Protein backbone atom coordinates (compact mmCIF):
# COMPACT_ATOMS: atom_id res chain seq x y z
CA UNK A 1 0.00 0.00 0.00
CA UNK A 2 1.04 3.60 -0.50
CA UNK A 3 0.23 4.53 3.10
CA UNK A 4 3.25 2.64 4.36
CA UNK A 5 5.51 4.86 6.45
CA UNK A 6 8.23 6.20 4.13
CA UNK A 7 9.75 9.20 5.96
CA UNK A 8 11.16 9.19 9.48
CA UNK A 9 11.28 11.99 12.04
CA UNK A 10 14.51 12.62 13.93
CA UNK A 11 14.82 15.06 16.81
CA UNK A 12 16.39 18.22 15.46
CA UNK A 13 18.89 18.55 18.31
CA UNK A 14 20.06 14.94 17.82
CA UNK A 15 20.44 15.52 14.09
CA UNK A 16 22.61 18.56 14.87
CA UNK A 17 24.60 16.39 17.30
CA UNK A 18 25.27 13.96 14.45
CA UNK A 19 26.30 16.81 12.14
CA UNK A 20 28.81 18.10 14.69
CA UNK A 21 30.18 14.61 15.32
CA UNK A 22 30.63 14.11 11.58
CA UNK A 23 32.48 17.42 11.21
CA UNK A 24 34.76 16.57 14.14
CA UNK A 25 35.61 13.20 12.56
CA UNK A 26 36.78 14.88 9.35
CA UNK A 27 39.86 16.24 11.18
CA UNK A 28 41.03 12.78 12.34
CA UNK A 29 43.32 11.33 9.68
CA UNK A 30 42.78 7.72 10.79
CA UNK A 31 39.02 7.99 10.24
CA UNK A 32 39.52 9.74 6.89
CA UNK A 33 41.87 6.98 5.70
CA UNK A 34 39.63 4.18 6.98
CA UNK A 35 36.78 5.97 5.21
CA UNK A 36 38.77 5.27 2.05
CA UNK A 37 40.08 8.70 1.02
CA UNK A 38 43.52 9.03 -0.57
CA UNK A 39 44.70 11.69 1.84
CA UNK A 40 48.20 10.33 2.53
CA UNK A 41 49.91 13.27 0.77
CA UNK A 42 48.08 15.96 2.78
CA UNK A 43 50.22 17.18 5.68
CA UNK A 44 47.46 18.07 8.14
CA UNK A 45 43.70 17.95 8.50
CA UNK A 46 41.57 20.08 8.36
CA UNK A 47 42.76 21.03 4.88
CA UNK A 48 42.14 24.77 4.49
CA UNK A 49 42.65 26.54 1.15
CA UNK A 50 42.76 30.26 0.38
CA UNK A 51 39.59 32.04 -0.70
CA UNK A 52 40.73 32.43 -4.32
CA UNK B 1 -18.72 49.30 33.54
CA UNK B 2 -17.36 45.85 34.31
CA UNK B 3 -16.33 45.22 37.91
CA UNK B 4 -12.66 44.55 37.16
CA UNK B 5 -12.52 41.08 38.76
CA UNK B 6 -12.98 37.59 37.33
CA UNK B 7 -16.07 36.51 39.30
CA UNK B 8 -19.46 37.78 40.37
CA UNK B 9 -22.07 39.99 38.79
CA UNK B 10 -20.95 42.34 36.00
CA UNK B 11 -17.55 40.63 36.05
CA UNK B 12 -14.82 41.37 33.52
CA UNK B 13 -12.09 43.82 32.68
CA UNK B 14 -12.73 47.57 32.61
CA UNK B 15 -12.39 49.40 29.30
CA UNK B 16 -13.05 53.03 28.41
CA UNK B 17 -16.50 52.96 26.83
CA UNK B 18 -17.03 54.40 23.36
CA UNK B 19 -20.36 55.48 21.92
CA UNK B 20 -21.52 53.43 18.92
CA UNK B 21 -23.74 54.81 16.20
CA UNK B 22 -26.49 52.18 15.79
CA UNK B 23 -26.42 50.20 12.57
CA UNK B 24 -29.20 50.90 10.11
CA UNK B 25 -30.00 47.18 10.01
CA UNK B 26 -31.21 47.48 13.62
CA UNK B 27 -34.31 49.43 12.49
CA UNK B 28 -35.84 46.44 10.67
CA UNK B 29 -38.78 46.11 13.05
CA UNK B 30 -39.88 49.75 12.90
CA UNK B 31 -42.97 50.66 10.93
CA UNK B 32 -43.01 53.42 8.34
CA UNK B 33 -45.70 55.78 7.16
CA UNK B 34 -45.64 53.81 3.90
CA UNK B 35 -46.58 50.39 5.28
CA UNK B 36 -49.07 51.71 7.85
CA UNK B 37 -51.04 53.46 5.10
CA UNK B 38 -50.98 50.45 2.76
CA UNK B 39 -51.90 47.91 5.45
CA UNK B 40 -54.94 49.92 6.54
CA UNK B 41 -56.37 49.99 3.02
CA UNK B 42 -55.71 46.27 2.59
CA UNK B 43 -57.63 45.55 5.79
CA UNK B 44 -60.57 47.44 4.27
CA UNK B 45 -60.43 45.50 1.00
CA UNK B 46 -59.60 42.11 2.49
CA UNK B 47 -61.60 41.96 5.71
CA UNK B 48 -61.08 39.30 8.38
CA UNK B 49 -60.05 35.67 8.34
CA UNK B 50 -62.63 33.16 9.60
CA UNK B 51 -60.67 32.38 12.78
CA UNK B 52 -60.38 36.09 13.57
CA UNK B 53 -64.17 36.42 13.39
CA UNK B 54 -64.52 33.39 15.66
CA UNK B 55 -62.11 35.17 18.01
CA UNK B 56 -63.93 38.53 18.03
CA UNK B 57 -67.10 36.85 19.26
CA UNK B 58 -65.25 35.09 22.07
CA UNK B 59 -64.00 38.44 23.39
CA UNK B 60 -67.47 39.96 23.04
CA UNK B 61 -68.88 37.17 25.23
CA UNK B 62 -66.26 38.32 27.79
CA UNK B 63 -64.30 35.09 27.29
CA UNK B 64 -60.78 36.49 27.64
CA UNK B 65 -59.18 33.18 28.64
CA UNK B 66 -61.28 31.33 26.07
CA UNK B 67 -59.97 33.57 23.28
CA UNK B 68 -56.32 33.20 24.30
CA UNK B 69 -56.54 29.40 24.21
CA UNK B 70 -58.01 29.41 20.69
CA UNK B 71 -55.51 32.01 19.46
CA UNK B 72 -52.62 29.86 20.68
CA UNK B 73 -54.10 26.85 18.89
CA UNK B 74 -54.58 28.73 15.61
CA UNK B 75 -51.33 30.71 15.56
CA UNK B 76 -49.01 28.30 17.33
CA UNK B 77 -47.20 30.19 20.09
CA UNK B 78 -48.44 31.86 23.26
CA UNK B 79 -46.58 35.06 22.35
CA UNK B 80 -48.37 35.42 19.01
CA UNK B 81 -51.69 34.57 20.65
CA UNK B 82 -51.23 37.48 23.05
CA UNK B 83 -50.65 39.91 20.18
CA UNK B 84 -53.61 38.63 18.15
CA UNK B 85 -56.13 38.80 21.00
CA UNK B 86 -54.91 42.32 21.75
CA UNK B 87 -55.39 43.29 18.09
CA UNK B 88 -58.88 41.79 17.95
CA UNK B 89 -59.94 43.68 21.07
CA UNK B 90 -58.87 46.94 19.43
CA UNK B 91 -61.13 46.00 16.52
CA UNK B 92 -63.99 45.86 19.03
CA UNK B 93 -62.71 49.08 20.61
CA UNK B 94 -63.22 50.67 17.16
CA UNK B 95 -66.75 49.35 16.53
CA UNK B 96 -68.08 51.01 19.69
CA UNK B 97 -66.63 54.34 18.55
Amino acid sequence: KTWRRWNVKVNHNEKRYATASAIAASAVTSLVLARGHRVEQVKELPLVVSNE
Amino acid sequence: AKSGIAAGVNKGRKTTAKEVAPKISYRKGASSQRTVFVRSIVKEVAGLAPYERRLIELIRNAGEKRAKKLAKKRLGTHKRALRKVEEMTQVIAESRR
Binding site: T2, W3 | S3, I5, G8, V9, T15, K18, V20
Partner: protein, 195 residues
Protein backbone atom coordinates in the same frame (compact mmCIF):
# COMPACT_ATOMS: atom_id res chain seq x y z
CA UNK C 1 -11.12 -10.20 22.27
CA UNK C 2 -10.69 -8.56 25.68
CA UNK C 3 -7.53 -9.74 27.37
CA UNK C 4 -4.72 -8.82 29.78
CA UNK C 5 -4.37 -5.46 31.59
CA UNK C 6 -4.36 -2.89 28.77
CA UNK C 7 -6.06 0.44 28.03
CA UNK C 8 -9.40 0.12 26.27
CA UNK C 9 -9.01 1.48 22.75
CA UNK C 10 -11.30 3.37 20.35
CA UNK C 11 -10.02 2.66 16.85
CA UNK C 12 -12.70 3.82 14.39
CA UNK C 13 -11.92 1.54 11.46
CA UNK C 14 -15.16 -0.36 10.88
CA UNK C 15 -16.17 1.43 7.66
CA UNK C 16 -14.55 1.16 4.23
CA UNK C 17 -11.81 3.47 5.45
CA UNK C 18 -9.23 2.33 2.89
CA UNK C 19 -11.26 3.98 0.12
CA UNK C 20 -10.71 7.35 1.84
CA UNK C 21 -7.00 7.49 2.66
CA UNK C 22 -5.19 10.73 1.82
CA UNK C 23 -1.38 10.59 1.87
CA UNK C 24 0.26 13.99 1.42
CA UNK C 25 3.01 12.83 -0.93
CA UNK C 26 2.68 16.27 -2.56
CA UNK C 27 3.69 18.25 0.54
CA UNK C 28 7.01 19.43 -0.92
CA UNK C 29 5.59 19.89 -4.41
CA UNK C 30 2.71 22.00 -3.14
CA UNK C 31 5.17 24.02 -1.04
CA UNK C 32 7.27 24.79 -4.12
CA UNK C 33 4.24 25.54 -6.30
CA UNK C 34 2.64 27.78 -3.67
CA UNK C 35 5.98 29.58 -3.45
CA UNK C 36 6.07 30.10 -7.24
CA UNK C 37 2.50 31.42 -7.10
CA UNK C 38 3.49 33.98 -4.47
CA UNK C 39 6.50 34.95 -6.61
CA UNK C 40 4.47 35.55 -9.79
CA UNK C 41 1.70 37.33 -7.89
CA UNK C 42 4.20 39.73 -6.32
CA UNK C 43 5.96 40.34 -9.64
CA UNK C 44 2.67 41.19 -11.36
CA UNK C 45 1.79 44.19 -9.17
CA UNK C 46 5.18 45.48 -8.03
CA UNK C 47 6.00 47.74 -6.31
CA UNK C 48 2.56 47.65 -4.71
CA UNK C 49 2.53 45.34 -1.67
CA UNK C 50 0.73 42.03 -2.08
CA UNK C 51 -0.92 42.20 1.36
CA UNK C 52 -3.56 44.69 2.43
CA UNK C 53 -3.00 46.37 5.78
CA UNK C 54 -5.01 44.55 8.47
CA UNK C 55 -6.22 45.81 11.86
CA UNK C 56 -5.36 44.57 15.34
CA UNK C 57 -8.16 43.01 17.41
CA UNK C 58 -8.60 41.30 20.76
CA UNK C 59 -9.35 37.66 20.70
CA UNK C 60 -12.70 36.44 22.12
CA UNK C 61 -13.03 33.75 24.79
CA UNK C 62 -11.76 34.30 28.37
CA UNK C 63 -9.06 31.80 27.43
CA UNK C 64 -7.72 34.19 24.75
CA UNK C 65 -8.45 37.72 26.06
CA UNK C 66 -4.80 38.30 26.93
CA UNK C 67 -3.84 37.88 23.26
CA UNK C 68 -4.09 40.31 20.39
CA UNK C 69 -4.05 39.32 16.72
CA UNK C 70 -4.67 40.59 13.21
CA UNK C 71 -8.33 41.08 12.31
CA UNK C 72 -10.20 41.12 9.03
CA UNK C 73 -10.48 44.84 8.27
CA UNK C 74 -10.61 48.29 9.79
CA UNK C 75 -14.02 49.42 10.98
CA UNK C 76 -15.98 52.20 9.31
CA UNK C 77 -15.49 54.41 12.39
CA UNK C 78 -11.73 53.79 12.50
CA UNK C 79 -11.39 54.79 8.84
CA UNK C 80 -13.67 57.77 9.47
CA UNK C 81 -11.28 58.93 12.20
CA UNK C 82 -8.47 59.09 9.63
CA UNK C 83 -10.66 60.59 6.90
CA UNK C 84 -10.73 57.74 4.38
CA UNK C 85 -13.87 56.67 2.56
CA UNK C 86 -14.56 52.91 2.71
CA UNK C 87 -14.61 52.54 -1.07
CA UNK C 88 -11.37 54.51 -1.39
CA UNK C 89 -9.59 52.52 1.34
CA UNK C 90 -9.94 49.32 -0.69
CA UNK C 91 -7.99 50.83 -3.61
CA UNK C 92 -4.95 51.86 -1.52
CA UNK C 93 -4.32 48.55 0.22
CA UNK C 94 -6.43 48.95 3.38
CA UNK C 95 -8.84 46.23 4.47
CA UNK C 96 -12.37 47.25 5.47
CA UNK C 97 -14.75 45.42 7.81
CA UNK C 98 -18.32 46.70 8.01
CA UNK C 99 -19.21 44.01 10.55
CA UNK C 100 -16.80 44.90 13.37
CA UNK C 101 -17.80 47.59 15.87
CA UNK C 102 -15.92 49.78 18.36
CA UNK C 103 -17.47 49.56 21.83
CA UNK C 104 -14.28 50.40 23.71
CA UNK C 105 -11.54 52.96 23.10
CA UNK C 106 -8.30 50.97 23.30
CA UNK C 107 -8.58 48.89 20.12
CA UNK C 108 -10.02 51.89 18.29
CA UNK C 109 -6.96 53.98 19.20
CA UNK C 110 -4.57 51.16 18.29
CA UNK C 111 -6.09 50.80 14.82
CA UNK C 112 -6.29 54.56 14.26
CA UNK C 113 -2.57 54.68 15.05
CA UNK C 114 -1.93 51.84 12.58
CA UNK C 115 -3.89 53.68 9.89
CA UNK C 116 -1.98 56.91 10.51
CA UNK C 117 1.40 55.15 10.35
CA UNK C 118 0.42 53.40 7.12
CA UNK C 119 -0.93 56.60 5.57
CA UNK C 120 2.24 58.45 6.53
CA UNK C 121 4.34 55.80 4.78
CA UNK C 122 2.05 55.75 1.71
CA UNK C 123 3.13 57.18 -1.65
CA UNK C 124 0.43 57.21 -4.32
CA UNK C 125 1.51 57.44 -7.95
CA UNK C 126 -0.31 59.35 -10.69
CA UNK C 127 0.18 60.41 -14.32
CA UNK C 128 2.70 63.07 -13.25
CA UNK C 129 4.84 60.29 -11.75
CA UNK C 130 7.85 59.29 -13.85
CA UNK C 131 9.22 55.75 -13.99
CA UNK C 132 12.37 56.93 -12.18
CA UNK C 133 10.34 57.54 -9.01
CA UNK C 134 8.44 54.25 -9.41
CA UNK C 135 11.66 52.24 -9.82
CA UNK C 136 13.00 53.76 -6.58
CA UNK C 137 10.58 51.79 -4.37
CA UNK C 138 10.89 48.15 -3.39
CA UNK C 139 7.93 45.86 -2.72
CA UNK C 140 7.41 46.18 1.03
CA UNK C 141 6.02 43.28 3.08
CA UNK C 142 3.20 45.01 4.94
CA UNK C 143 2.59 42.25 7.49
CA UNK C 144 6.24 42.32 8.57
CA UNK C 145 6.60 46.11 8.30
CA UNK C 146 3.50 46.79 10.39
CA UNK C 147 3.50 43.77 12.71
CA UNK C 148 1.02 42.86 15.40
CA UNK C 149 2.58 43.63 18.78
CA UNK C 150 1.52 42.15 22.10
CA UNK C 151 1.12 44.83 24.77
CA UNK C 152 3.74 44.08 27.38
CA UNK C 153 2.96 42.49 30.74
CA UNK C 154 3.42 44.82 33.67
CA UNK C 155 6.92 44.43 35.11
CA UNK C 156 9.34 46.48 37.16
CA UNK C 157 8.84 47.80 40.66
CA UNK C 158 5.90 49.43 42.42
CA UNK C 159 4.80 50.26 45.95
CA UNK C 160 2.88 47.65 47.95
CA UNK C 161 -0.68 48.66 48.91
CA UNK C 162 -2.49 46.13 51.11
CA UNK C 163 -6.29 46.42 51.46
CA UNK C 164 -7.97 45.29 54.67
CA UNK C 165 -10.09 42.68 52.85
CA UNK C 166 -8.23 39.78 51.29
CA UNK C 167 -8.51 39.02 47.59
CA UNK C 168 -9.76 35.51 48.38
CA UNK C 169 -12.58 36.96 50.49
CA UNK C 170 -13.39 39.42 47.70
CA UNK C 171 -13.75 36.53 45.24
CA UNK C 172 -15.91 34.59 47.71
CA UNK C 173 -18.21 37.55 48.31
CA UNK C 174 -18.53 38.29 44.59
CA UNK C 175 -19.54 34.67 43.97
CA UNK C 176 -22.05 34.71 46.84
CA UNK C 177 -23.57 38.01 45.69
CA UNK C 178 -24.01 36.72 42.15
CA UNK C 179 -25.43 33.40 43.35
CA UNK C 180 -28.11 34.91 45.60
CA UNK C 181 -28.80 38.09 43.61
CA UNK C 182 -32.05 36.74 42.15
CA UNK C 183 -33.60 35.53 45.39
CA UNK C 184 -32.51 38.48 47.56
CA UNK C 185 -34.17 40.97 45.23
CA UNK C 186 -37.34 38.85 45.17
CA UNK C 187 -37.36 38.84 48.98
CA UNK C 188 -36.89 42.61 48.79
CA UNK C 189 -39.70 43.25 46.30
CA UNK C 190 -42.26 41.12 48.15
CA UNK C 191 -41.40 42.90 51.42
CA UNK C 192 -41.29 46.58 50.48
CA UNK C 193 -44.65 46.61 48.70
CA UNK C 194 -46.43 44.63 51.43
CA UNK C 195 -45.08 46.82 54.24
Amino acid sequence: AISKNLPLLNNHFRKHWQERVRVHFDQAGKKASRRQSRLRKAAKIAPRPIDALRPVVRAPTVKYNRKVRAGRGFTLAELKAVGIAPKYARTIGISVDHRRQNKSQETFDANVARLQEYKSKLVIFDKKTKASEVASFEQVDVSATFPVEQPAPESGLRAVEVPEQTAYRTLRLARNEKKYKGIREKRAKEKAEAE
